[PDB]
Structure 1
Amino acid sequence: LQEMEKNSAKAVVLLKAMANERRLQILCMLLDNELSVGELSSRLELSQSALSQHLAWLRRDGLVNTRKEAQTVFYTLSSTEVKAMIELLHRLYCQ
């Protein structure tokens, strides 16, 4: 069974994208919500740069969508997989 290899390939792309405290926090705060870079940096207490690297990771692997308004960059959860995963992690670890 090596279809498990491609399945685990994409799945591990997702997990590696999520296997980080800051990135996981970002993803958790973006669930059922839409936040900006300033809001994320404020609620997570991070510099916009240290936040920008993580957001760059999330954008590159297609876990988040970006929308520009004025001088504000809004982020949202992108794929259904990351939405479901974040929901499950939220139910298991946040309530």
Structure 2
Amino acid sequence: LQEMEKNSAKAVVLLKAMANERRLQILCMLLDNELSVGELSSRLELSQSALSQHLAWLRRDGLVNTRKEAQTVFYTLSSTEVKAMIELLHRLYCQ
């Protein structure tokens, strides 16, 4: 039970970051892509203001990486775990 608690906690950080329609939408779009914040706002149809908080959560919990080019911030998926989970969700629900 203890080791199951140990692992369940970390998995749950990941799940809690994914368990939101907007954060999941972002993650799904980043799968095998690098997208700007402008593109994310356009595709999600959320203002950049509402977007920034979702992105902030994904940055804080380590699900996403960033880089800056001129006036553009580019996001990609980060961890092996999130990539694997997004791939799977894509196959079950999209592909």
TM-score, length-normalised on structure 1? 0.98
- Tell me which residue corresponds to 2:87: 87
Measured after TM superposition, the shift of residue 10 of structure 1 is 0.3
Q: Which runs of 5+ in 1 are unaligned?
A: none
**Normalized per residue, which structure has more helix?**
2
CA RMSD, 1 decimal: 0.5
Figure out how many residues of one structure are paired with residues of the other and give that number: 95
Query: What TM-score do you get using the length of structure 2 for normalisation?
Result: 0.98
Between the aligned partners of 1:54 and 1:6, the Cα distance in structure 2 is 26
Question: Deviations 1:8-53 (Å, cap 9, x if unpaired)?
Answer: 0000000000000000000000000000000000000000011000
Which stretches in structure 2 are left out of the alignment for 5+ residues? Answer: none
Return the offset for 1:2. Answer: 1.1
Counterpart CA distance in 2 for 1:38 and 1:65 is 16
Please report how far the alpha carbon of residue 63 of structure 1 lies from its aligned counterpart in structure 2 after TM superposition.
Answer: 0.3
- Map Cα deviations across residues 53-72 of structure 1 (whole Å, 9 max, x no partner): 00000000000000000000
CA distance in structure 2 between the partners assigned to 1:8 and 1:54 by the alignment: 23
User: 1:66 aligns to what SS in structure 2?
Assistant: strand
Partner of 2:46, secondary structure, is coil
- Are 1:58 and 2:22 an aligned pair? no
